[PDB]
Amino acid sequence: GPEMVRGQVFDVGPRYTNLSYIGEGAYGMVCSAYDNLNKVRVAIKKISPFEHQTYCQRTLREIKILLRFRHENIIGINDIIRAPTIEQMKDVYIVQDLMETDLYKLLKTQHLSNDHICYFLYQILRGLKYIHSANVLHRDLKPSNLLLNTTCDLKICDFGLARVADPDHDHTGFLTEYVATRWYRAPEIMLNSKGYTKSIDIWSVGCILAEMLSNRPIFPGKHYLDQLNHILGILGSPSQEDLNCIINLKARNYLLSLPHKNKVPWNRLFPNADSKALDLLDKMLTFNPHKRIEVEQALAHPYLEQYYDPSDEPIAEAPFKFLPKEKLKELIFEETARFQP
């Protein structure tokens, strides 16, 4: 008989005992557990994707990307538990370092010092530099995907929605795309972008920085179509030059149809913020994604000078250079084989 949690099978033993329900995540039930080999408590995520192709896609991305990546600011996969055979495999359990909290939970009740904001931002960008160097876009950066342990080591998690960057095929039509989580979604997603360029991730980091400064999301759209209203309400009307970069007529004419809006100065929105932090914020939350600061520039920004050290900001050895659910299950089975005894 497998272990049960909340009346649901959570079959991780015998290596992992003393289970404690933590909650529900994007993939399902999450528990903590005692790792009897490493004598430490761990996090375990139960995934049940095999009945749906799209679930299999996300699960395969998550596993394949995290197994290849090795970086201090990216969550590792310590172990993967599943049945010994493909026909017996229904659930997959991903084992990771237990982390005290995440930035979403933290920002609910804790004010961050400028020193913490600086340190968190540095770690996010250090992790992102590695991700982008692997030719990968995370595409769902937000506070709840930033894990923190008791000593404020930050690790980026959930690569289920990630893609290989494809800037030459990024252009699309107006109001069609569905990339990232709404509050953290770049303006071009609603205008003319499929979210296949690294600048998508930098926008999200900008949103996260703003949220660290005030403990409130900076662009709280109430639904998909509301999000652009909030972004433009703060950035103001885009310039002629930036509009000229949008060739799509529906997108450009939508923007031209709007009354003028003034830029709201960052120092009025954040009167207690470090001036260097606001300068960097402005560069990450730049409307035109071609003008938007890139991850290596952001690391070199004066705000982060106490931490900046390119030789200690490693890149990926093996970038990613480039199906029915049954084939995906087979790939998930193969991808997880290394953890079997």
Ligand SMILES: Nc1nc2[nH]cnc2c(=S)[nH]1
């Ligand atoms: N507490 C906690 N620790 C983790 N380690 C990897 N993911 C997690 C989650 S979702 N929660």
